[PDB]
Amino acid sequence: MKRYRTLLFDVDDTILDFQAAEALALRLLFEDQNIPLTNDMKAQYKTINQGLWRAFEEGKMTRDEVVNTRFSALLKEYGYEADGALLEQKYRRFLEEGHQLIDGAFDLISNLQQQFDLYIVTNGVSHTQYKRLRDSGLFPFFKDIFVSEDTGFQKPMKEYFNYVFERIPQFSAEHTLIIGDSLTADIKGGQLAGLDTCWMNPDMKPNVPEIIPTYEIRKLEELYHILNIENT
């Protein structure tokens, strides 16, 4: 039977609770600006932010443009003249203080480190991901951290994965699994790159693009059975 050797983990909403970090950072940003954060505004922020990150994944926008325009795009249509780069800098500081964990992530990663080689694969801002991984105690369990900004490309692009593969000693695709919550960055990314994929989908979101993962789970602890190792 197949035994994976190398696990590539996405960060946000895979092992760290990015939703929680985002929720806190948005609240604090809007309090900082003394602007009421209505349900309608929060919903539009999420749609705008999602569309801009997708444009970046697709190669249609730089990440800097994504993060430096999302808050000006939102506030401008609600009638506020806003400096998108300044708002992002404030948001960024608050986001970098949120290192909430996904349920079971610490115990899972600690257990897997004993039997597999673990790596991080992320499109997130390098400083932000390093800091949140350090603060949550996850950082030392990973052999390396591969950030899109070093590569010239981003998940799901095949060239991002080429960069990662060249930097894993004795890399074998057949013995590698990528685990992440994004159909578009992680699952499409891994599939393109010749990897088995594991979709973290706790909320049983639909698969609108029909990007089919090798596995789909709701909780990280379901990995023990997929990886065929005993939980401890």
Could you tell me which of 148, 94, 92, 142 has the C-alpha nearest to residue 118?
Answer: 142
Candidates 14, 84, 78, 85; CA nearest to 41 is 78
Rounded CA separation 164/173 (Å): 11
* Residue of 10, 17, 186, 196 with catalytic role: 10
Structure tokens at 31: 């309090």
User: Among all chains, which residue has been given the structure tokens 């801002």?
Assistant: 125
Q: Which of these, 187, 150, 176, 182, lies nearest to 12 by C-alpha position?
A: 182
Distance CA 111, CA 1 (A): 21
> How many residues are present in the chain?
232
- H helices within 33-186, ranges in order? 39-57, 63-77, 84-95, 105-113, 126-135, 158-166
Q: Residues 6 or more apart from 202 whose CB is under 8 A from it?
A: 218, 219
64/74 Cα distance (integer angstroms) = 16
Residue 103 known to be catalytic: no
> What are the sequence ranges of the domains in the chain?
2-16+101-232, 17-100
Q: Please, which residues bridge with residue 200 across strands?
A: 217
Resolution value (Å, 1 decimal): 1.7
Question: Radius of gyration (Cα) for the chain, nearest Å?
Answer: 18
Q: For the structural domain made of 17-100, what CATH number should be given? A: 1.10.150.240
SS3 state at 181? coil
User: Is 219:105 a contact under the CB 8 Å cutoff?
Assistant: no
189/21 Cα distance (integer angstroms): 25
C-beta separation of 215 from 198 below 8 A: yes
According to the CATH classification, is domain 2-16+101-232 in 3.20.20.140?
no
Q: How far apart are CA 158 and CA 229, in angstroms?
A: 30
List the 215-217 sheet strands across, edge first.
Answer: 144-147, 117-122, 6-9, 176-180, 196-200, 215-217
